[PDB]
Amino acid sequence: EQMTLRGTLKGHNGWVTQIATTPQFPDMILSASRDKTIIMWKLTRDETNYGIPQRALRGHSHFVSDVVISSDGQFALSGSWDGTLRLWDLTTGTTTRRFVGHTKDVLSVAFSSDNRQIVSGSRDKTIKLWNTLGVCKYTVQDESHSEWVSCVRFSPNSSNPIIVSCGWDKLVKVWNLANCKLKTNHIGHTGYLNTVTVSPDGSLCASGGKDGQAMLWDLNEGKHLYTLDGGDIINALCFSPNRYWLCAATGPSIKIWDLEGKIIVDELKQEAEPPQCTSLAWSADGQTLFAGYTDNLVRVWQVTI
């Protein structure tokens, strides 16, 4: 098990901020950018190009911060510094719905497993729950973060209906999805938080940001498990879909940790400051890790023995 650079995706004119993949369309991936667009890529996989831009999703009036695809792979949900969310029909490449409610930049978006619910985190310090019709059903304002909410994620475990969030208040908050009331405050971080991610079984949550420590929290028990040293600002986190791996975009490199031995499997670097990695997303088959950078490129990392 070792990763190598297979290729790059050139098209964006600004930083790549997020990457989204779908099991229904393995030859198609989405990327969010500071160039205000989301690019739909066509994965060609040839001697000249790994992928090519198929379509560009335009409409947001500022940096696109987050992008996620629906379970059927037919729709995309984006968030932007314009203070709105947008639902996109992938076939037409059109916005079908605008989500107006946040009073500041939207930093994070997410679809619930059933795709019936939508969450957003914003610079306005609130977490908003919406339906697919752009109606805000709930605003979490109170026992909420006292600073910018940088990331909001759902857990795939239906027995413990939960939303996880992190913010610039250095806290990780676990919310009961049924009543939208605080379940747990996870104290430990010494710096602002950029990201939170939930494992495929919904038992683990990894948080990261400024302090460079990837902290693992048990969602079932409501307790800290262990911490992994990222040794640089953590910009993004994701668990492998098919491996017991935790991936962190630590400054310019990508640190891959084996959760069994709590050890580095690999560290993916490019060879005055180098491009910083901002986003990570595993392909449908879990053999390809796509990563976004501050040099506007998407780098394609492939699993090889």
Q: CA-to-CA distance for 279 and 298, rounded, in angstroms?
A: 9
What's 132's DSSP letter?
T
* Phi, psi of 151, rounded to the nearest 5 degrees: -155, 135
Second CATH level (architecture) for the domain 6-305: 7 Propeller (2.130)
Q: Alpha-carbon distance 101 to 251, whole Å?
A: 33
Name the experiment that determined this structure.
X-ray
SS3 content of the chain, % helix, strand, coil (to 5): 0, 55, 45
CA-based nearest residue to 66, from 126, 140, 153, 157: 153
Going by their DSSP bridges, the two strands 234-239 and 245-250 should be labelled as antiparallel
Element (H, E) at 67: strand 64-69
Question: Is-contact 299 29, C-beta < 8 A?
Answer: no
Quick one: which of 192, 188, 275, 203 has its CA closest to 239? Answer: 203
Q: Residue 106 is encoded by which pair of tokens? A: 């939207």
Count Cβ atoms below 10 Å from residue 129 Cβ, excluding itself.
Answer: 20
Do 204 and 217 meet the contact criterion of CB atoms below 8 Å apart?
A: yes
Question: Which residues are registered as beta bridge partners of 95?
Answer: 88
Helices (H) and strands (E) in the chain, counts: 0, 28
Rounded distance between C-alpha atoms, residue 98 and residue 88, angstroms: 9
Residue pair 146/168 in contact (Cβ under 8 Å)? The answer is no
The domains of the chain are located at 6-305
300: amino acid identity, one letter: V
